[PDB]
Amino acid sequence: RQEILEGARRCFAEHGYEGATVRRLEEATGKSRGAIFHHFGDKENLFLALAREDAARMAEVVSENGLVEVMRGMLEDPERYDWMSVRLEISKQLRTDPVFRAKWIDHQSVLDEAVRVRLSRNVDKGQMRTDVPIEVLHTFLETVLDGFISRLATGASTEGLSEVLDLVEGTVRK
């Protein structure tokens, strides 16, 4: 299972979401079409399980330092850009396919909750600005994150990005 997810993350990154064929998946994992669908059912579910893994990892990071720290980590990891692209191929599906949408959102919930807890702790400590509702701050942070993912996925340089993150953090602080 862990073997399947690692290999599949590699396969999706290297070949894309449609290009991630049963053939390619067996090739990346060394397991069969049968033992892959056995755990997960279909491609979409294997995808969501990988998304949920990312979400749980990011959630731990957010707990320590925030969404800005997740973004800092992305600057340190250029090898993961290919996987980030995979993630962006699905957007119309995410927006219009209601069952898929709900599943995507549910698989992200650990992260969404970690971000809410973190911001709550910041507010409780008096560290965020209070002239802007916390929910606007939250949407701003999530927007910057999506921006980072997109730019990095599409081949932008890291340049000035660590300074952009300093600006982003400064923007939400008291």
Chain positions contacting its own copies, by CB under 8 A: 16, 18, 81-82, 84-85, 88-89, 91-92, 94-96, 101, 132-133, 135-137, 139-140, 142-151, 153-155, 159-161, 163-164, 167-168, 171
Q: Is 173 annotated as a binding residue?
A: yes
* DSSP codes joined into one string, 48-92: HHHHHHHHHHHHHHHHHH-HHHHHHHHHH-GGGHHHHHHHHHTHH
What minimum distance in Å lies between the beta carbon of 52 and Mg ion?
A: 24
The one segment of 58-66, 72-80, 84-92, 120-128 that binds Mg ion by CB under 5 A? 58-66
Residue 23 near which of Mg ion, its own copies, none (CB within 5-8 Å, type-dependent): none
User: Using N-to-C axis directions, what is the helix angle for 43-65 and 109-124, rounded to 10°?
Assistant: 10
Q: Which does 164 bind (CB under 5 to 8 A by kind): Mg ion, its own copies, none?
A: its own copies
Name every residue whose Cβ is closer than 8 Å to that of residue 38 and which is 6 or more positions away in sequence.
Answer: none
**Residues 16 and 86 sit within 8 Å (Cβ to Cβ):** yes
Q: Given the complex with Mg ion, which of 7 and 66 has the nearer CB atom?
A: 66
| Cβ atoms 31, 3 nearer than 8 A | yes
The Cα 22–Cα 60 span in angstroms is 32
* Amino acid found at 8: A
Q: Is 122 annotated as a binding residue?
A: yes
> Which is nearer to Mg ion, 57 or 72 (by Cβ)?
72
- Min dist CB 63 to its own copies, Å, is 23
Residue set of the binding site: 67-68, 118, 122, 169, 173
